């Protein structure tokens, strides 16, 4: 209910303050990359990011109003999407590269170290280039990331209406941000559409990433944390 009462600027401020920290990887430059060592770094990073994502999710307006059952299920469905849009966001100012961590900046040729990962890198890079082409704002980014959290699992379920009202509220917030940016009324709904259509591609990358991660697990390439194993099992 508190979410529904917030203004658009209160929505923005809340989401901005709730932002997770940028973590470093356990990258060791004294040893060369292997398929296993590369997957190790990425999944180790993802595991630690997940803990901060959970704290972030609870600070997303309206999310704490849900049952534990619903919270778990939304996070299980959206976690890789959320990791990816964050990655794509912080890679914007690094054309042709992916900033997994400040001490882990990789190009697509380094993605070839892991079997079948370069295809995922290419999609991530293209998404990053798309955001850069649209000049995505930070305030828009945190709106999109919260949308992903609330939407990706909303249909694989009265509480449903609550989520939808919060989603409509974020829609209002996006429009307000665009109007505040000086975009015409036509440009506003056009850009809103452009941004939301990207979420369909983020969904796509996540599903492919889930398959790839599951493949690396079933081939014993990398030991996954019990948390990651649980998040993965939710999609299988």
């Amino acid at each position: 209910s508190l979410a529904l009462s917030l203004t658009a600027d209160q929505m923005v401020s809340a989401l901005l303050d709730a932002e997770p920290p940028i973590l470093y990887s356990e990258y060791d430059p004294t040893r060369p990359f292997s398929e296993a060592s590369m997957m190790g770094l990425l999944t180790n990073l993802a595991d630690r990011e997940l803990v901060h994502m959970i704290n972030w999710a609870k600070r997303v307006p309206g999310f704490v109003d849900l049952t534990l059952h619903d919270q778990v299920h939304l996070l299980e469905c959206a976690w890789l999407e959320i990791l990816m849009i964050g990655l794509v966001w912080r890679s914007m100012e690094h054309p042709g590269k992916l900033l997994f961590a400040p001490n882990l900046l990789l190009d697509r040729n380094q993605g070839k170290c892991v079997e079948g990962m370069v295809e995922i890198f290419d999609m991530l890079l293209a998404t990053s280039s798309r955001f850069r082409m649209m000049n995505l704002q930070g305030e828009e980014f945190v709106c999109l990331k919260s949308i992903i959290l609330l939407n990706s699992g909303v249909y694989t379920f009265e509480e449903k209406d609550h989520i939808h009202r919060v989603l409509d509220k974020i829609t209002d917030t996006l429009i307000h941000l665009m109007a505040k940016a000086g975009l015409t009324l036509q440009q506003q709904h056009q850009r809103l559409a452009q941004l939301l259509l990207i979420l369909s591609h983020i969904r796509h990358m996540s599903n492919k990433g889930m398959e790839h991660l599951y493949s690396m697990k079933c081939k014993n390439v990398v030991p996954l944390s019990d948390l990651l194993l649980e998040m993965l099992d939710a999609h299988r």
Partner: peptide, 10 residues
């Protein structure tokens, strides 16, 4: 239970 289930309870 799930680890996720407990982590949210923090």
């Amino acid at each position: 239970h799930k680890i996720l289930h407990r982590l949210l309870q923090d």
